[PDB]
User: Which sequence fits this backbone?
């Protein structure tokens, strides 16, 4: 009939239903398995179900395709929650947005993506939020140091990329970094990609147990903020109260 474009959304609300929407890469025969779980403590046992890394010291390669789109002349928002319930030592917690040309059964560390975004932890020296744009054959990393969350709780990560070559990074629905694409990377069409068609979780973990949930790819900042409050905002207080109840035990 005669609104925000929701290019991709995943909340894992239909039990085993997610297996049809996500594809495991067969590039290697030893990739780790994601399992559906809400972990040992949660805000809501059912709502907080997400994809959890289940095997230590493994590479992960799982991806979801969606009807392809271009962000040309549009704002692009990529958002998701990451919960390092295990008290992570070293491991990725970022997503990669690929063009539709990706063969999902062959996705691996070298697969050509458009944008990579999210937290990476590797001991005390790396607690950072990556913001990477693939530009003219190179993966260009942000020149700002954005500290990521390293506790056991669910955190919302949001990247906003605007058609005026500006961006914003939010953690828990609050701005943590912003600036211009020309200023914050060493590169007017910089922001735009002809095609996005796959969101991938392509990463390494030593201590596994991270849970990913509430993925959203949209062209509207205000909608991503509302969805953020409907997901992460609903989890927050009750999840903390449950862990506090358990810590005392
Ligand atoms: Ca969920």
Assistant:
């Amino acid at each position: 009939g005669s609104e925000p474009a929701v290019y991709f959304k995943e909340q894992f609300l239909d039990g085993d239903g997610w297996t049809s929407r996500w594809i495991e890469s067969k590039h290697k025969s030893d990739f780790g398995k994601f399992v559906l779980s809400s972990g040992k403590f949660y805000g809501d046992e059912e709502k907080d179900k997400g994809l959890q890394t289940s095997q230590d010291a493994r590479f992960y390669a799982l991806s979801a395709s969606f009807e392809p789109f271009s962000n040309k002349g549009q704002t692009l928002v990529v958002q998701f929650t990451v919960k390092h319930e295990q008290n992570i030592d070293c491991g990725g917690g970022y997503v990669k947005l690929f063009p539709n040309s990706l063969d999902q059964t062959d996705m691996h560390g070298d697969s050509e993506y458009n944008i990579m975004f999210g937290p990476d932890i590797c001991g005390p020296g790396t607690k950072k939020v990556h913001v990477i744009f693939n530009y003219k054959g190179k993966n260009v990393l942000i020149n700002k140091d954005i500290r990521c969350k390293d506790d056991e709780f669910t955190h919302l990560y949001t990247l906003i990329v605007r058609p005026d070559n500006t961006y914003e990074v939010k953690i828990d629905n609050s701005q943590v970094e912003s600036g211009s694409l020309e200023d914050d990377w060493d590169f007017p069409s910089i922001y735009a990609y002809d095609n996005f068609g796959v969101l991938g979780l392509d990463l390494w973990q030593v201590k596994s147990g991270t849970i990913f949930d509430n993925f959203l790819i949209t062209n509207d900042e205000a909608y991503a903020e509302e969805f953020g409050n409907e997901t992460w905002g609903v989890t927050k207080a009750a999840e903390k109260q449950m862990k506090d109840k358990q810590d005392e035990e």
Notes: The first strand starts at residue 6 and ends at 10. The chain is about 15% helix and 45% strand.
